[PDB]
Symmetry: D2
Subunit: 419 residues, 4 copies
């Protein structure tokens, strides 16, 4: 039993722990609240680096896990650089920090605030506890025991979107971007030559780049539902505008207007790629072409209309959505840069449905402070620590600065809920 | 009587003359064809600078009026720099050439190929000439006489889009971006304080910048149909992709698919601004805010739902398209960055309608080589030297490189048509 | 009587006060030490902006007045941005902060740590206090009274270098860069046309830029002892390398080797200009030249060998140092970007000479911690809070980060000296 | 027998051939002059890429082998891009062309103008031909025969500077940068771990980068006579200023003043590195350090005062020039980035000394048009197609634009000399 349980100790949960630790170290009341963290994965560099993949880190160095909420925090990137002796040299770089550096930073913060974190500890189920015909507690169930609380934070996220056509095919030679590194490693010393990469966002771009980087004979077929990479937005949304203002506006709309907004928003099609990532991919392809190798093939306005696994790889049928013209590609492997599914009700909350209010789609009803609206519940609070189009008008991001700000809103709400 | 008449001696017509002059100077057959040019405006720096406004010139220096068609042309920008003694210093700049420099270049080319151009010579009408019950010639009519030809090129463009709500109001204090400079000059030494600028493209951006640049007390209200300037595309379309490939794809679609493409294309909403222009505007506003002046006000997802001219300026009602919430602004002047109208049939071709084929909207039917399809016509050819969404899938651009390429296609087609 | 007196409340003294305030607010012992600050100039934005002139601020935002010493300080630039509500927009700029912004920051810090500062309070003299035939105290004398201390910090700097040839001429039409703004303002609404600007550093560059910016008919003659602006180093020294490592190396040399080092160092001639300043000046001159105005004239390898004030401005004789060829220029005004004199013994320490050790040139003998070495003194300490070639191997800089680091070394040394 | 012989068919000789071919194709008189080219090396991509090494190609694309002399040449980079179909994509890169691209360009030009070039044809000696007691011809001697001419162009350059201390040591594990690639290849699949790289210019930088790039365990000791790479000039000289103006000024000095100029010039120490090369090296080292590897060690103000080859690599003694402090390094291999020797009289002109005038150092006396001054010679002309400090005030560069301009001056001088 603790005052709260947070599920997930990725950046979002770390950011939240940093708010509590800032408070503890400053002797403020919030620091007394006891919170435990349950993370399914192990405490490893590999896993933290897995978490940053697909994320646009072409942003200012102040937009770290704590500074936008509290620049005096001992977990700021400036404190990280100073501890590592690199403040001056970092400034001379003239570029934003690398993914690898942000990972290291993230391990450096984690290591300092993880005293209440249980790793290798997946949540398998969350069971209700009813007492007077009304929900009073929940029991978070894990392989290493169970935990009880009135206050729950979900900081674990959502799952890969795998269209039905591909589910039977998931394997070593056809996989989602979320397992890109692991899957590539399984090939050992020899990658297959012919690749198809589906999708138009940063995860797709980085996969393409990594494939044409690893082996000079690899050929990549890059399929886009709309225009290709050359017409994507430069920078992911949270790096172009101050997202909380857009989250505010979205909450100020009534549900009918929200749906009109999302229909416009979805057809506007904002999907953005770090401009340095675009540049790396375009420059490398260009250099390749000087020697005659043209190794990236682009198919715009296309969907995969059929696919089968044969003895000689995959036979993939593309259909151009406008012309209806079709063509067939034979490849050795396929990468799905299809992104992640927005849950209506996260699977872990399955058993609590009777005490959860319904939004217009039956899913979770989430307020501006990330709190889940309940019904027939006595003192039980739940927060979902992330963005979504359906609740907030914006796709979920691994933006460190957004996590910092959310952590502030949640940690304060958690304090009020214990008095 | 000449073998051809080109209407317009802006960049597009100059580019075309450069193809003929290249050919003449090289002794090639195309140089013998006699062509005259009729330009409504005078031969002045002011007018040439008026023509470049709103245009993204953040492109490579090779994408000039001739080089993409013929790098050996004596009208290349490299030859311009060498003639002016600035080749070395230009390279040291590390930035793209300025609008002012491209204007000067353009006057420098014009001055060398304008021996067949009649300026201050507007076309008021174009009359048919029928002989055997079929159209054999046209008579281009001007205030300074008339001209006869079987071969006509329209390089004059299209007109400002002025919504009905504003037509009665056009004047010194409410105007289109195409007269921005002229109108601003009329105020002399004192601009009005409160401005409304409607629109989201580069012409809107540059107007805003110029207004907040000219006077530190000016306040600008910037109204956008969708998201504001911070979410526009960086770079206009022809600077992001090789437009002719997209023009090819659009022509390869049948008319039903073209309409499906434009419906998608129009909701995707690509409207782009030179990234240095965005940067100039954002930096200046930011610097202003350090001293407390917040002088640019943004209204997204908004339309003007009512406007009236009172004794104290304009009273403007905005409606947020999603929320339906309204608000009122009082301003002293209004700038319409509404862009330009695509004609279905340009006004100058009014009298030739009976010999012009019809596209799906009754307008001109234009092929991939910019030729207008005719009916019941003997040897008479017409070209429209520009882009449009309806014929080519792309908005009309003042892209110098595109003009160069078009000039090649048209000048060759003109040669074949005289034998 | 206070434990210490610091003379100067420019950035250097502010940085020092920030160390004490950080300590006070954290309850650390250093915060108990009482220190007063005497600043000759008034507490005004004009004066703070006067202090930043000539300074390369093209450096990373962490290199502020406190962060390199203590990122958790409440006076960090991140805390400044957050207080002003500009953290997100600052990141979107993609450029370093402007001089104007750093000034504002500096006023924002000053306002929070100036409770022990007396402004408009010049030090006219510092008198010794001898007791047992040995120096025990000093009496800092001002127009508003006198102050006694064993611990003295000089944070006031040094004076403009005015060669003998110019001293009689100093006036409204011939002046040093340190009074550039004040002097320009005296002209009111009309500047003179013909200017000569002597010097090759950033103060010279910025003067040139400001002159050709203010008036399109102004002509500037820019005279350089060596090569001109196009061959200056990009960035001032402290922005190219971590200066303290170079200060360390210089202290590790014995005096004979130091002189050999400075002779090499002085002939290497490192004088650097913010690359954006060079760019602004070169771009503007280039744009000017498109229209025919060539308004900046450069004379390399030149000295002024004679000058006289006539009724028609100045008659200036230049001599090329290599060729010995001479020429005469007639100008209306002259700007001396000659920099600042390194004192051997600052004038304010005149009366303490008998208790001050001598370096190889008779001047102050300063250790690595900025302490002045004394003789026959009981408990009396003096620090000079700045760099110099003669003591530290580097020219004095207004580098904010260096001030932060020095402040740490001095404030700790001050603490030890009071127990 | 031909009207002229040019020794060397690297960029300089290719540039010269382009002037003749431009003239031939335009029917101008210069095209009739017969000239043959003798190149020692073979016609291979490997060799052309060997020629560009150490060269700052961070310059504008107009500064190619022909354009600064004649933008209409069919050998312009714009014509190259157009022939390869890459003009548009090149512009989208937003960076300067790569070394690899400039090599390809250079092969593309060579292939079009090499019809008078004999490859694998070294000049071993050049013998005089005296007739009336005065020199009338020269006989260029090669392994494949001999050639006679009154007009000689030397476009072969100069030799690696190898200090005496190293001559006996030249081998697979200690080599000059000019054989860096060849030597590295000899190691096959395993490079040695510990490297010393001597020197401060671009060849040194690129060697360092390539070594730390090839193998993550390699350690590099980088020794500099003065300050290290962080204080080098950004950009080589010809990319910072218009070199011909500086060559003009140097020729306008009398010999006594030239020596004073070079003494200043040599102590100013301008040696420049492509800013993107510095950036690549600094970024990679920085990224390495995040994981704990610090693999580049810098020694400023140092010379190698002793070195010996032992059974366990090299034992190298460094002496700091100022402190006189020494230290010893043990490394497995050494790279000499010592640059190239300026000949006083090139070895190939050994036998013509009696007909060659003497400059102040006994060496060649070369005018502003690159002509060698002779004595007692009837109609015999020689040109050295390169820069040098001793004749022109500037170090020899592989600047393509400079070659273009020189080619113009030489080809015209060659024409006058045949009538």
């Amino acid at each position: 039993h603790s005052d709260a349980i947070c599920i997930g100790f990725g950046p979002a949960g770390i950011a939240l722990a940093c708010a509590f630790e800032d408070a503890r170290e400053a002797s403020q009341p919030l620091g007394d609240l006891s919170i435990g963290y349950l993370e399914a994965a192990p405490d490893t560099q590999w896993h933290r680096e897995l978490l940053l993949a697909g994320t646009d880190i072409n942003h200012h160095v102040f937009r770290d896990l704590v500074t936008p909420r509290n620049p005096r925090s001992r977990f700021s990137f400036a404190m990280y650089l100073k501890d590592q002796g690199r403040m001056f040299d970092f400034g001379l770089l003239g570029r934003p920090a690398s993914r690898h550096e942000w990972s290291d930073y993230l391990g450096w913060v984690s290591r300092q605030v993880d005293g209440h974190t249980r790793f290798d500890t997946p949540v398998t189920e969350i069971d209700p506890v009813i007492r007077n015909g009304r929900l009073q507690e929940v029991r978070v169930r894990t392989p290493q025991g169970s935990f009880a609380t009135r206050n729950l934070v979900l900081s674990s996220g959502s799952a890969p979107r795998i269209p039905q056509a591909f589910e039977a095919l998931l394997g070593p030679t056809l996989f989602h971007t979320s397992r890109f590194l692991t899957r590539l490693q399984a090939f050992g010393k020899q990658l297959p030559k012919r690749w198809l990469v589906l999708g138009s966002g940063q995860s797709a771009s980085e996969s393409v780049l990594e494939l044409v980087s690893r082996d000079p004979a690899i050929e990549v077929h890059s399929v886009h539902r709309c225009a290709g990479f050359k017409l994507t937005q430069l920078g992911q949304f949270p790096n172009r505008v101050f997202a909380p203002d857009h989250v505010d506006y979205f909450h100020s709309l009534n549900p009918a207007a929200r749906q009109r907004f999302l229909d416009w928003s979805r057809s506007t099609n904002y999907a953005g790629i770090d401009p340095d990532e675009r540049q790396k991919l375009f420059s490398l392809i260009y250099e390749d072409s000087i020697a005659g190798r043209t190794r990236l093939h682009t198919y715009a306005y296309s969907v995969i209309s059929a696919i089968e696994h044969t003895a000689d790889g995959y036979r993939v049928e593309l259909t151009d959505t406008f012309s209806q013209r079709t063509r067939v590609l034979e490849v050795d492997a396929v990468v799905l840069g299809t992104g992640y599914q927005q849950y209506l009700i996260p699977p872990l909350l399955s058993g609590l449905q009777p005490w959860l209010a319904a939004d217009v789609d039956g899913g979770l009803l989430i307020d501006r402070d990330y709190r889940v609206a309940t019904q027939g519940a006595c003192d039980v609070n739940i927060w979902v620590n992330g963005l979504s189009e359906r609740s907030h008008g914006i796709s979920d991001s691994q933006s460190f600065s957004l996590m910092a700000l959310r952590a502030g809103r949640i940690a304060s709400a958690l304090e009020r809920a214990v008095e």
